[PDB]
Structure 1
């Protein structure tokens, strides 16, 4: 579109020109709040054609929102970690929504992996996945990035089942208020149920809001994808958590890992651990584990 030339110069390194990209509109991978993700293809700097996923960003109408995203996207282009999903780049078609090109992750998301009846995950298998998420997130936090929507579904699995943390950089402070709104009848899987008590009262997010969300993610892993706070009337959730009640310890979840989960859900954000400490504590648990067993589905 007709954007500030100075901006496009400023953000050059993120941008893939639209004529280097093919989005397969007939090959939709999936749909969600922030946009649609299609199968796609793009042309390298080295001139080869690489297949990947492409997400049309449906929540960026304003030009202020476009340029803000372009600049975050530049910082995200710099993110390099084994447990973080890479940003290939962003494409602006002459008229339309910004598109985000992402590496295709061929084993899907962590939630569907764990929910699969074709699979028989052990306790230790699931804790390991959690460990890989805490490294993804430790890096993001070190790089001054706040996810805002950490959950099992936004953790992808690559060819060799390496977990990549993903869909950070989409939700924003205050502007995406409605994404974290209450009372929507079909409420079992809304982001409200993963997000920290104080973020629900301001729609401002920090790394410590991400530590809450991680705890909730770690519960999913060990329930093999149960909805959190399932039977809590959605309008009663903030009051419930203020009472100091929390998700119950999963059947086969070790006491120590539940103690970790509890630390993540501390109501004082400052009392919650850092992801650096979480990688350490969770790693220690995996090695300390005496025996192992299968976990069942809810």
Structure 2
């Protein structure tokens, strides 16, 4: 059956599968792994494991294998979900990646929105989220995307919900190696979560089925809006039908409340019609870095 890759192959009996982590289009499971670091063979670690759905066609198998091989080639970076190991021999196909304890960025932000709350303590009107951390989140997603771009990897669905947050609040770009079938997209279809993925698509991607890294930049611009709305849904109260014509008329989202003009400027820059007139991820990393270092250091 599948070829043995000793560099990545991990003994399946060293896995202890646990509770699911989400939906997927295979099954994702939180698992316990022993000896992932071969220097510490009896040391436990929490990982994420992707497997095949019950009654999976040969396509579902080919998709996961394809996704497995993409992650091998892209390599390691602190701001993406990294491949840890695989199980290809003598049993079902397992793909083992890093686990993000705090879930996706959208839920992270929404669950940490600021407080008519009865004031206790010295910091009652002080929410968990502060401006510099928000910028840091944006900066990390940018650096992560930059790495992917350098690996000639286009995400095609960059969004706050496709960014994962670790125990130490590190942003990791999720699901970057998926074959999402961009020729059969139901633009009207609303996900289980209530999301309309069409709201993250660049015009050249939506209208012309053209994806580039500049297409991801457009998406990143939408992600920027999500961050500083603390998990707000883009184009509020606009159904897909209206979004079509609005985008054709060149409509853009308004400046969100409590958002400095520097960042709304970057958003609008990412939403420039001409892809060449949008910033690169390298420029985004640099721009966001300047804002990050401009914080008051007491």
The TM tier, using the shorter chain, reads 0.7 to 0.9
Q: Which residue of 2 aligns with 1:55?
A: 50
- Superposed displacement of residue 40, structure 1: 0.8
- Superposed displacement of residue 50, structure 1: 3.0
TM-score for the superposition, normalised by structure 2: 0.81
Q: Which residue of 1 aligns with 2:27?
A: 36
Alignment map for 1:89-168 (pairs within 5 Å): 89-92=85-88, 98-117=93-112, 120=127, 121-168=129-176
**Number of residue pairs the alignment of both structures matches:** 276
Say which SS state the counterpart of residue 217 (structure 1) adopts. helix
Q: Which residue of 2 aligns with 1:21?
A: 15
Say which SS state the counterpart of residue 81 (structure 2) adopts. coil
The answer to whether the Cα contact below 8 Å between 2:30 and 2:47 also exists between their aligned partners in 1 is yes
Alignment map for 1:1-298 (pairs within 5 Å): 2-3=1-2, 8-9=3-4, 12-24=6-18, 27-32=19-24, 34-43=25-34, 44=36, 45-46=38-39, 47-48=41-42, 49-56=44-51, 58=53, 61-62=58-59, 64-76=62-74, 79-92=75-88, 98-117=93-112, 120=127, 121-172=129-180, 175-178=181-184, 180-184=185-189, 188-288=194-294
- CA–CA distance in structure 1, aligned partners of residues 57 and 152 of structure 2: 23
Alpha-carbon distance change, 53 to 70 in structure 1, aligned in 2, over 3 angstroms: closer
The answer to whether the Cα contact below 8 Å between 1:14 and 1:73 also exists between their aligned partners in 2 is no
Alpha-carbon distance change, 277 to 249 in structure 1, aligned in 2, over 3 angstroms: same
Say which SS state the counterpart of residue 7 (structure 2) adopts. helix
- CA–CA distance in structure 2, aligned partners of residues 51 and 289 of structure 1: 35
The answer to whether the Cα contact below 8 Å between 1:148 and 1:171 also exists between their aligned partners in 2 is no
Runs of 4+ in 1 over 6 A off after TM superposition: none
Alpha-carbon distance change, 188 to 287 in structure 1, aligned in 2, over 3 angstroms: same
Alpha-carbon distance change, 261 to 69 in structure 1, aligned in 2, over 3 angstroms: same
- CA–CA distance in structure 2, aligned partners of residues 219 and 257 of structure 1: 9
Alpha-carbon distance change, 239 to 52 in structure 1, aligned in 2, over 3 angstroms: same
Q: Which residue of 2 aligns with 1:294?
A: none
Deviations 1:189-227 (A, max 9, x none): 122111211112344422111111111111001111111
**Greater mean deviation of Cα atoms: 45-54 or 192-201:** 45-54
**Greater mean deviation of Cα atoms: 274-283 or 237-246:** 237-246
TM-score for the superposition, normalised by structure 1: 0.81
- CA–CA distance in structure 2, aligned partners of residues 64 and 37 of structure 1: 17
The answer to whether the Cα contact below 8 Å between 2:190 and 2:196 also exists between their aligned partners in 1 is no
Alpha-carbon distance change, 16 to 141 in structure 1, aligned in 2, over 3 angstroms: same
- CA–CA distance in structure 1, aligned partners of residues 155 and 57 of structure 2: 18
